[PDB]
Ligand binder design. Structure first.
Ligand SMILES: Nc1ncnc2c1c(C#Cc1cccc3ccccc13)cn2[C@@H]1O[C@H](CSCC[C@H](N)C(=O)O)[C@@H](O)[C@H]1O
Length: 279
């Protein structure tokens, strides 16, 4: 891995500053855990996480969600979880009074009834629904996510966002405004990000040129940037994905006090890896 000296990783898609012509055990739960820890910890910093109800659609099996709840439960943050998925969740989520497990595929009608029974409490939406997928599959997925936003009207959302490939384009579509969070420990050449929105909802048109820009920017990220060693980075592992993970974890709150920030991130990574059974 070619060496590089960085002050900070790319945290959002907009920060990628070059492009290129496209050509771990249970790593997926780790990718979801960090992005959702990052998203929810940003909301905790804004003081809007407390008292909220996190509605997670497409949450199964959702092994990592147990670590998320235990983290905010041990911080004293009052959170209710509603995990909704047609598939059965990981049994490790059983027996938690603040975690409601719902075995159901959501449609427009069911989103209405969710909103009725949760209103007027604050809703935070996490969607990871997925139906290899075609462009029509993504367009239906992203349409369903817009429907989630228009109905549930969350105070904030994290949405699965991968642009359709330019060579499989069908039509222009619309997605919410927000910041497109980059995912460490994503698959080696995944172009998937998490759209993070805080609502104070204006839609954005997504064009075939944007698909080209996503494809080239994410390929440069996956081929060049993520295969670097950050030699100035004071950490036991200096591979970029660990550098990237480090900057996400420093936004995470802890009841325990540490002599240094590096000691905190090391503890958090140890805890996350140990729960996810990663060496
Ligand atoms: N509507 C839904 N409601 C609930 N869950 C759903 C869906 C859904 C759909 C869909 C349709 C989209 C558009 C149009 C349609 C028209 C007709 C029918 C369906 C759709 C997928 N899922 C679940 O997403 C998971 C993906 S991997 C997450 C992994 C997880 N994040 C983890 O932590 O492991 C997987 O378990 C699925 O069962």
């Amino acid at each position: 891995m070619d060496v590089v000296s960085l002050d900070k990783p790319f945290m959002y898609f907009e920060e990628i500053d070059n492009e290129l012509d496209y050509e771990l055990p249970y790593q997926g739960q780790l990718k979801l855990l960090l992005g959702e820890l990052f998203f929810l910890s940003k909301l905790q910093r804004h003081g809007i996480l407390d008292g909220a109800t996190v509605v997670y659609i497409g949450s199964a099996p959702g092994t990592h969600i147990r670590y998320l709840r235990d983290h905010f439960y041990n911080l004293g943050v009052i959170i209710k979880w509603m995990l909704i998925d047609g598939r059965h969740h990981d049994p490790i989520l059983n027996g938690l009074r603040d975690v409601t497990l719902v075995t159901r595929f959501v449609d427009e009608e069911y989103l209405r009834s969710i909103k009725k029974q949760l209103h007027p409490s604050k809703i935070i939406l996490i969607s990871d629904v997925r139906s290899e997928p075609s462009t029509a599959d993504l367009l239906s997925n992203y349409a369903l996510q817009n429907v989630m936003i228009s109905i549930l009207n969350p105070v904030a959302s994290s949405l699965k966002w991968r642009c359709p490939f330019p060579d499989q384009w069908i039509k222009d579509f619309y997605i919410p405004h927000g910041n497109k969070m980059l995912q460490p420990f994503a698959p080696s050449y995944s172009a998937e990000m998490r759209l993070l929105s805080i609502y104070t909802m204006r839609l954005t048109r997504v064009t075939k040129s944007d698909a080209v820009n996503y494809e080239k920017k994410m390929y440069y990220l996956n081929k060049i940037v993520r295969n670097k060693v950050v030699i100035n980075f004071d950490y036991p592992n200096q591979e970029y994905d660990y550098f990237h993970m480090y900057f996400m974890l420093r936004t995470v709150y802890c009841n325990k006090t540490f002599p240094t920030t590096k000691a905190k991130i090391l503890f958090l990574q140890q805890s996350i890896f140990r729960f996810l059974n990663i060496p």
